[PDB]
Write a protein that binds this DNA or RNA. Structure first.
Lengths: 61, 178, 213, 208, 135
RNA sequence: CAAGACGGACCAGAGCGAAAGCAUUUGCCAAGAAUGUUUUCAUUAAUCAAGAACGAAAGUCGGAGGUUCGAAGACGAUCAGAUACCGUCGUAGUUCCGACCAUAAACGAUGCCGACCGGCGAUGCGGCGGCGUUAUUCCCAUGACCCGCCGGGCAGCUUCCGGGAAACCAAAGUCUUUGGGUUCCGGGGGGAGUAUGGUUGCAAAGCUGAAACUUAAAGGAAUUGACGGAAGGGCACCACCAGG
């Protein structure tokens, strides 16, 4: 939420907004870790595939 | 009558005393204003008299005295006294970027170079005069020249290498119809 | 279209009886237009006056903030508000190798005027001092500062505004401090730096009557 | 000396693009000379140009030739945009620029000096040259600086201007003097041809 | 229209020269500062954006305020010199010296040159980031 | 007037602290090195697996407050191709309080303790010896300058002490003439500080940490300059000016 804070807001208004921003912060960190894991698995599999290409299937006859 | 007094630092009191005759000669000859050195106040006071030819000569004399006290060369001060469009643009080193300690000193090197070669090249290219005091850089020249000098000095003071900075300054000088 | 300066007026502002030069000048004031009185409108103004514009023989690096209070038929009775040093002078004072001592006091005078007074002092290089450094140790600095507060209080708290203003024009306080600090560490140049105005008594006339004449 | 002009027959592109430029049947390909050391005196009209000074300060000879070709193409496009009679550039490739050929049946248009025109034809050509110079100075905001009898071609009773590679903007340090020299050369060429209505060099400079 | 004083005494005003990096403000007040007289900015004369901070706009504004103060009888001016201050550049620019020079040209009696900038004891934060500023 | 922030200039090749770090006055709190001692204990010591406190900034949980600045996010310029670039706002954050986090180019890129080994002349602190100078001549002591000497520091200059691949270093010296005590740690370059496992963590992450496979180099100091798209001069009626 890109809502500029004014001077007139009181408690249970700023608190809820900060807790909300905290919530999507924690969530966004969760899918950041998930994407790190997915790209890690994909890179490990593609490295195994490339090294397999080095080991087998490269030639003419 | 009115007078203008310029304070004199102790770090340049002997340089001003050595060049006292060469400063007081054009001040009383070409402008015709009384000049005194209040040793108690350590201030150079220039006052008008009945021998004053015209207005704004006292302002030019004050500008020349400020240029001499700041650390600029005597010929540069005389040229600023003779010419009309001359300004003393000064900027603190820490205004360009937040720099503290040894890195700040190294940044001075990035304005100076080995021997002052970068400063001399910038002075020749931009047609300005640059004095690098301990945390300050004072530039004297034309308004467009002062703008080009400020841009080049800020670029060198922001980490950029001196070769690329010199090339950019040469490009700006060629693009300014110098 | 209509020139606002035609509705204006030029009131006179004078220095008090303390200073040799009397007329400190002219003020542009919008005239009374029924609702708001011009006298009340100009009652809360400050004036920055140099000491060489008040006394001929004195120095030029002191400035005075002064409040006017009363209107006397295109005449303004002005009271002393505070004093400060010239910024060019302050930039001239701070040398590289020289310890600076600052102090402030909050002194209520005998006539009810509560002031926040400031004092700056620089250390003195000696006549045969080969050593470029002239640093004062911190306990000597604290002792100098404590003597500075006690001396400034002892020549301000015992007096009204008249004697304190009379003392600060030649800086008798500064000469007294520089005389008294030669026992601890010989000091170079001490002045009362800034005079702030903390608390003003109730406004009336007779004090201003004797203050102007 | 600096470029070679070749007449050629253009092809018909079979690509039915709505934005495809129409290729002329006869085209002129100008290829600038890159192996000749006689181009050391051409830096005066390139270093003064603000559009390429940051490029001219660090240009190699091949890059200088490419920048000159680009400047010539831009000058030709500016002249075509103002309605001045000049060849229309189709495509530019490095140091070779392709423009519309001036002539017919692979015969280039003869120059103004080599054209034997009558008195009325000479007056019309002088008026067309003056109008073209005024349009270049006012609308194109450029000075040809190489205008002469060999830089103008006569085709179908019209005067066409070529070699705009050395053209510079009027804001150059010596653009006005170069325009005055070109006007003086045009005035001398008109006075040699018997045009009594031809103005002097100063009058032509003031009018342009 | 003006003060009713003899020729010998000169009427004192306070001329604030605020030299920003956009343009310059030449604002004339009394010695009080309460009621002003004239404020001619850089955008009064130059119809552009580059030359707002140029010395030409400064000298034109100085000529305008000099004409105005001669119209309204103001014969002497104390000059307070101001830069943008704060965390920004502390030194007054070339527009300030150009404006004071142009005022001194137009017959103005020069009083005190008091360099009044809002200099911080300690800034809050520099407007630029940790990287750098000014290209 | 109010709000929070930060303590410039003084500010030094200075100071203190185990490091991180520490700059407005005043009081309190308990520390702390060095110096001085014809004081006391008498071997109580050095370094340390395990284990334990502190640990910049950023981050994470609960509150408060939010001036400035500002990750994100929103504008506008700039173009054969700009999405970097520049200026305008702006959320978390930046601040305080209580817990996690334990990482930095956390750098003197130099473990800690001890011995020997050149010179110089400055600086800080303490002490000692002093011609003389100032507290309006001080009436005795006493502060501030000047000349030394000692101890422990912070650093500089210089040397063919010796080292060293050299840059350089009074330690990086006393090393094939190799042994004072001790701790940690490196073994051609990548993969890789990666995967897996254990453990700490709310989380992000931290500590420990491979291999398969891959290459003949990767790297360190110093010396020149092909070339400047680097700047100067200087030369020539086979170049120019004045001309013929």
């Amino acid at each position: 939420s890109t809502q500029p804070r004014s001077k007139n807001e009181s408690k249970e208004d700023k608190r809820a907004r900060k807790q909300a921003i905290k919530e999507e912060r924690k969530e966004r960190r969760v899918e950041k870790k998930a994407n790190k894991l997915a790209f890690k698995l994909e890179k490990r599999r593609q490295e195994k595939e490339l090294l397999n290409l080095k080991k087998n299937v490269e030639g003419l006859k | 009558e009115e007078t203008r007094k310029i304070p004199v630092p102790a770090n340049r009191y002997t340089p001003l005393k050595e060049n006292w005759m060469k400063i007081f000669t054009p001040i009383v000859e070409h402008l015709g204003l009384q000049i005194r050195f209040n040793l108690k106040s350590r201030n150079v006071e220039i006052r008008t008299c009945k021998e004053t030819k015209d207005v704004s000569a006292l302002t030019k004399a004050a500008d020349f005295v400020k240029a001499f006290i700041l650390g600029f060369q005597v010929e540069d001060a005389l040229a600023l006294i003779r010419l009309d469009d001359l300004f003393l643009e000064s900027f603190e080193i820490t205004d360009v970027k937040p720099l503290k300690g040894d890195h700040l000193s190294r940044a001075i090197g990035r304005i100076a170079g080995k021997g002052g070669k970068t400063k001399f090249t910038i002075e020749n290219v931009t047609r300005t005069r640059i004095v690098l005091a301990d945390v300050k850089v004072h530039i004297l020249g034309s308004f467009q020249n002062i703008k080009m000098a400020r841009t080049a000095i800020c670029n060198l003071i922001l980490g950029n290498p001196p070769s690329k900075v010199y090339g950019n300054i040469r490009a700006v000088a060629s693009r300014s119809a110098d | 279209v209509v020139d606002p300066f035609s509705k204006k007026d030029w009131y006179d502002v004078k220095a008090p009886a303390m200073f040799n030069i009397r007329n400190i000048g002219k003020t542009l004031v919008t005239r009374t237009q029924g609702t708001k009185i011009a006298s009340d409108g100009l009652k809360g103004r400050v004036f920055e006056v140099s000491l060489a514009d008040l006394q001929n023989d004195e120095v030029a690096f002191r400035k005075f903030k002064l409040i006017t209070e009363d209107v006397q038929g295109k005449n303004c009775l002005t009271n002393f508000h505070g004093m400060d040093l010239t910024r060019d002078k302050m930039c001239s004072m701070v040398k590289k190798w020289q310890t600076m001592i600052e102090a402030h006091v909050d002194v209520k005078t005998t006539d009810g005027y509560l002031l926040r007074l400031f004092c700056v002092g620089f250390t003195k290089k000696r006549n045969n001092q080969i050593r470029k450094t002239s640093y004062a140790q911190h306990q000597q600095v604290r002792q100098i500062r404590k003597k500075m507060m006690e001396i400034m209080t002892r020549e301000v708290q015992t007096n009204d505004l008249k004697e304190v203003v009379n003392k600060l024009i030649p800086d008798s306080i500064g000469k007294d401090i520089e005389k008294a600090c030669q026992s601890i560490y010989p000091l170079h140049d001490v002045f009362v730096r800034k005079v702030k105005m903390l608390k003003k008594p109730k406004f009336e006339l007779g004090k201003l009557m004797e203050l102007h004449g | 000396k600096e470029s070679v002009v070749f007449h050629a027959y253009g092809g018909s592109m079979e690509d039915e693009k709505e934005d495809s430029k129409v290729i002329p049947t006869e085209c002129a390909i100008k290829v600038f000379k890159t192996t000749l050391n006689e181009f050391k005196n051409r830096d005066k009209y390139i270093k003064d140009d603000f559009r390429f000074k940051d490029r001219f300060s660090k240009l190699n000879p091949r890059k200088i030739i490419r920048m000159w070709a680009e400047k010539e193409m831009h000058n030709l496009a500016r002249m075509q945009r103002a309605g001045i009679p000049c060849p229309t550039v189709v495509l530019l490739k490095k140091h070779i620029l392709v423009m519309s050929f001036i002539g017919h049946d692979q015969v280039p248009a003869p120059k103004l000096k080599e054209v034997k025109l009558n008195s009325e034809e000479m007056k019309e050509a002088y008026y067309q040259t003056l109008h073209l110079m005024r349009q270049l100075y006012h609308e194109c905001t450029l000075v040809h600086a190489d205008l002469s009898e060999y830089n103008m071609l006569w085709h179908a009773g019209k005067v066409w201007l070529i070699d705009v590679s050395q053209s510079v903007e009027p804001t150059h340090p010596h653009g006005l003097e170069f325009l005055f020299r070109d006007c003086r050369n045009v005035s001398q060429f008109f006075q040699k041809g018997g045009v009594k209505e031809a103005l002097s060099e100063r009058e032509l400079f003031n009018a342009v | 229209l003006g003060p009713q004083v003899a020729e010998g005494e000169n009427v004192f005003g306070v001329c604030h020269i605020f030299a920003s990096f956009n343009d310059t403000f030449v604002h004339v007040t009394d010695l009080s500062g309460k009621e002003t007289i004239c404020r001619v900015t850089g955008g009064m004369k130059v119809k552009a954006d580059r030359d707002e901070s140029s010395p030409y706009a400064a000298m034109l504004a100085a000529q305008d305020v000099a004409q105005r103060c001669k119209e309204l009888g103001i014969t002497a001016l104390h000059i307070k010199l101001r830069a943008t201050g704060g965390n920004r550049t502390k030194t007054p620019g070339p527009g300030a010296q150009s404006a004071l020079r142009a005022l001194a040209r137009s017959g103005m009696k020069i009083g005190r040159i008091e360099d009044v900038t809002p200099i911080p004891s300690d800034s809050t934060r520099r407007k630029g980031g940790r990287r750098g500023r000014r290209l």
